[PDB]
Design a protein around this nucleic acid. Structure first.
Ligand SMILES: Nc1ncnc2c1ncn2[C@@H]1O[C@H](CSCC[C@H](N)C(=O)O)[C@@H](O)[C@H]1O
Ligand SMILES: Nc1ncnc2c1ncn2[C@@H]1O[C@H](CSCC[C@H](N)C(=O)O)[C@@H](O)[C@H]1O
Lengths: 259, 261
RNA sequence: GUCGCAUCCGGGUUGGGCUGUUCGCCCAUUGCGGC
């Protein structure tokens, strides 16, 4: 039963999931690492194949829930992993397919809108921040891949439960308009400090790639806000900016007043 | 004054070795990659020993050398020396700076960060970039990844060279803090106080722990207050650099007119 | 998993760790194919 050779045909099929085209073709993707597998399961994703290395714990096998369990050697593990030093627990899950059509927001939502194409590592970090602050919705560009290994790793698995939706620009604009959601453009040259916006009644922050925001979006915004920069640096990391904006809104919703 | 073409030239291997912390210690030199970062190291007063120019360098780059040796690298030799998938066209070999807390004085209400056991150079660089944005008066790096790693330099966009950032032994951080009579505020996910409810308008030192294990218990006890940033989702903790930025900007908000919660 | 070819002392061509994972990262230390 053990799969020992990196050349075994099953290892070949599992390592091919590293490529987005194969993930699309098969409807499957790899989740590497015990914590990320736990989070994918707790999020309700369908585990198809559990992969266990030689150092897996007894409890790891109990995660399978009726999926096929494969025991791989270190050498077979190394061909599937995205890491120089592989995890001992990985899962092959079915790709989730979520549409914004159903989504209904409450009266004072906290929304992040990510415009443009961000690097996978930065995106994963943004989504962790969004999860921490309890964002009700994150919108990203139509072709964004939420199930790359960097997004999964840098999100610490937060990507699985987070309401994040890749959508066309017009679909995003329409959704926001139909919610009558105030748009707040975050830009280093914003006319107001970000503490001066009022986010107690619901906000959609607009954020560009580490890049910048498109002009028509900045102009449509009710307000453009800047994070003060007191040294020589001109800008902060996008994930950091996303966290600063979201936690500011949380502060106000916790009783804080606009500056 | 030399043109190097072979990636296997002896100089090139010497230069790529500077990516190892161990070679930087052995030699006393380090590599600064990227035109902006070289500008910042120069502006900060660091000694440039060797300027490296790639094929797409521009004429003004050569005038940065100020009497250092200037080496011309082909695209292939440049690839070996670069720490990047896509190499920069301007790089400098500088002498490692000598900085001590001996000559540091703080004003009445300084804003300080103490980083304990951080291991990811990208995290350190993002923190330094936030400290720069927020105007921190001092950053103590206690026993973590090395301050002059390529990713610290790159992710701080060179702010590492001008920021008042100092690597210290953990026990020296404790002594410097006691010496300065600075209130210590321990950031930890289980902290009893929401971070917005601390008053940071007086002197304050925020304490941040390691990515994996967090803050040691002894440091939590030293703190006057343990503060937490609320977590509302599935994640149990935030990234250490995001945490640092959130703390720095809450203090800035308060110092800019805002009231504690 | 296994098998050469190197190479270094027959014997070795490493251990670990990681809440940013990417020409992945960190820390002790002491290669290159094929199937
Ligand atoms: N100090 C700051 N104030 C406001 N938004 C900021 C910021 N630093 C970064 N951001 C946000 O982070 C994104 C990526 S950072 C790129 C900044 C770029 N020079 C620009 O002019 O936008 C930006 O699009 C912006 O939305
Ligand atoms: N929600 C939060 N509140 C306060 N500090 C936090 C935080 N998330 C991360 N940090 C900071 O980031 C550092 C690394 S996070 C380490 C997490 C570890 N599981 C633990 O229990 O601490 C922590 O030591 C702390 O200084």
């Amino acid at each position: 039963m053990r799969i020992e050779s990196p050349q075994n045909p099953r290892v070949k099929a599992l390592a091919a999931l590293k490529e987005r085209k194969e993930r699309e073709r098969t409807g499957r993707f790899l989740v590497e690492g015990r914590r990320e597998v736990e989070r994918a399961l707790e999020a309700g994703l369908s585990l198809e194949t559990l992969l266990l290395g030689p150092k897996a714990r007894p409890e790891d096998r109990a995660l399978a829930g009726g999926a096929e369990v494969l025991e791989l050697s270190e050498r077979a593990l190394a061909r599937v992993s995205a890491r120089e030093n592989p995890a001992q627990v990985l899962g092959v899950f079915r790709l989730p397919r979520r549409s914004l059509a159903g989504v209904t927001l409450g009266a004072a939502p906290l929304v992040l809108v990510l415009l443009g194409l961000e690097k996978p590592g930065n995106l994963g970090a943004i989504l962790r921040a969004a999860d921490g602050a309890g964002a009700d919705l994150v919108l990203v560009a139509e072709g964004v891949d939420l199930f790359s290994p960097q997004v999964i790793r840098n999100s610490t698995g937060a990507v699985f439960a987070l309401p994040v939706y890749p959508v066309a620009e017009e679909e995003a604009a329409r959704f926001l308009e139909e919610q009558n959601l105030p748009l707040v453009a975050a830009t280093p040259e914003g006319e107001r400090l970000y503490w001066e916006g009022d986010y107690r009644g619901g906000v959609a922050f607009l954020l560009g790639a580490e890049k910048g925001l498109p002009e028509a979006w900045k102009r449509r915004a009710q307000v453009r806000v800047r994070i003060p920069m007191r040294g020589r640096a001109d800008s902060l990391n996008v994930a950091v900016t996303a966290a600063l904006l979201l936690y500011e809104a949380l502060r106000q919703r916790s009783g804080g007043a606009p500056l």
